[PDB]
Design a protein around this ligand. Sequence first.
Ligand code: CL
Ligand code: CL
Ligand code: CL
Ligand code: CL
Lengths: 203, 203
Amino acid sequence: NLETPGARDLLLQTASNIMREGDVVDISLSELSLRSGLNSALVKYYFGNKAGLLKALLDRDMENIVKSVDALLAKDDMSPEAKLRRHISKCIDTYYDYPYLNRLLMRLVRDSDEAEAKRIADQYLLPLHRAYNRFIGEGVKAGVFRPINPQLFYFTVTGAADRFFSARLVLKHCFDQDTLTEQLRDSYREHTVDFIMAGILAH
Amino acid sequence: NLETPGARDLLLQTASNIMREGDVVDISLSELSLRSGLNSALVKYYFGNKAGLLKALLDRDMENIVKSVDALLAKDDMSPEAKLRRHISKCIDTYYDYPYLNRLLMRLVRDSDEAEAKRIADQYLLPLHRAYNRFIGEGVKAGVFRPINPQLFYFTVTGAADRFFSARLVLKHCFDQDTLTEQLRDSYREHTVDFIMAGILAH
Ligand SMILES: [Cl-]
Ligand SMILES: [Cl-]
Ligand SMILES: [Cl-]
Ligand SMILES: [Cl-]
């Protein structure tokens, strides 16, 4: 087999775009072929079946959040407050691009065989949970953060961004209220980072 | 026509239960008939079609949140902090029962004709928005709340509860991890009310 660079990525971005433009978390392989211009066999070649493509889409979309959690424990010169503000900003940027991400995670947990559903849930419900827990714990011990459950905190950040971007996209698509301007999204990220930080910061 | 009390309500609760048990936001009229024991014609009689039943389900599920926003401006002897804590607790209780509610709102906005999509969006994106805005504004002027966008605040509360209960139900259904004990849910509501309040309270 002779590799064709870019093809796998095109299939994943096309699936993403269909979902995002459609306010859905499902695609047909026939619409994927029509929109990408690539034939049926390529999905099977790269991903095996639709479940494989969706799992690869989830893996891809989650990369920046996973990296942001790993950066929490990096030896840089950033305070715990600065590091957390950056992690929340990354999550938000991710849901702007992939607002369907929580729903995609849920359907794959729901529909996969048990062993696979467990691997997905264990990986992505709270990404790199040992790192996340250690960062929050450290911050509590240092008097920077009030005691909080990291899983709940992550649900709060990601739930909030999902709500906002999903709503704004639905309104854009229904009423042609293109509102997701750079000025609005920056206002959103700032307000939301501030709210979430106020939620966690001690005293 | 001779009325049959309870039948309409049974159809709506059956639709709710299918969605909640299935981790879905869709139903077939045939499963609704099978699970409720009532025939096809009754859906048509009460609701016209599936879109009508779903809209009636949304209306029903949203009643307690709508009432909680109206209680914000009630002349009781409760502080703004007490009133808001109660509103957040109501939202949370609602998403425990109806975790699919944000998704149900979204699909009805997405799929209805424009005029109807606008009525739904205008009613439920920020419930009783004039009341909500006036309560928050008052609290800011009194020095109780920091300046915040009520729509974002509501998205944050409802997004968080949706994430939590939807995840916990998916895990319950996939791994038979019945965790939604009275002790867990009360811990959830307390942690989440505290976090959200810390987010909004001045100084
Ligand atoms: Cl910043
Ligand atoms: Cl918490
Ligand atoms: Cl209380
Ligand atoms: Cl805000």
